[PDB]
Amino acid sequence: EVETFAFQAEIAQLMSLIINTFYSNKEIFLRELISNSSDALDKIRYESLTDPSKLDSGKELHINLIPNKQDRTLTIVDTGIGMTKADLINNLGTIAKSGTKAFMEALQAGADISMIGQFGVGFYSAYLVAEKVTVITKHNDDEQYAWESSAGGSFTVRTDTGEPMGRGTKVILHLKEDQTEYLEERRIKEIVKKHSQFIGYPITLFVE
């Protein structure tokens, strides 16, 4: 069974701006998603300080970058805290409504799309390079779920039948056909080095 939800108006408006902008510095999407992974890895780490059993689902805290030119996908995998179904629906709620609303006001006032993460809505920079985004996630307190959207004003949530993840979040970027550079080793290596290498977790770029 699949549930389909409408985005908040402000989030749909931001998604339409991002997916259609000709903003040239699109590479910032990767910094924003790796930042989200780092924050999620922190969360499970701080939690495990008191409750070490919280790492029973996976002791390794890392980020993997998996390009696939056959599928035209860039996947970012982390073993952070993951999200419950409730988290998946709540995270698209009122904190995200006010952040998107305010980022759009900043852009009108001369701000740069690169500031998106400052309002806590950096995830949506994915749509600079992706026509569809699938988020697979597994939290200790819930089962594995798949969130997905092609920025048409709606997203879906379903229980995920795919391979068990253990714990964490997998973001699958279905790239626009003219954003295939983000499958190239040389390009990903540049972007990580320029914007993300001082993240406090291992970042592994897989070969294809």
Ligand SMILES: COC(=O)c1c(O)cc(O)c(Cl)c1CCc1nccn1Cc1ccccc1
């Ligand atoms: C806990 O954070 C994670 O599991 C996680 C992660 O590990 C790596 C990532 O790239 C992202 Cl986007 C998230 C989720 C970060 C988030 N918090 C609040 C809102 N959203 C965006 C959202 C995007 C899509 C679905 C639900 C939420």
Ligand SMILES: [Mg+2]
């Ligand atoms: Mg939209």
Ligand code: NA
């Ligand atoms: Na291009």
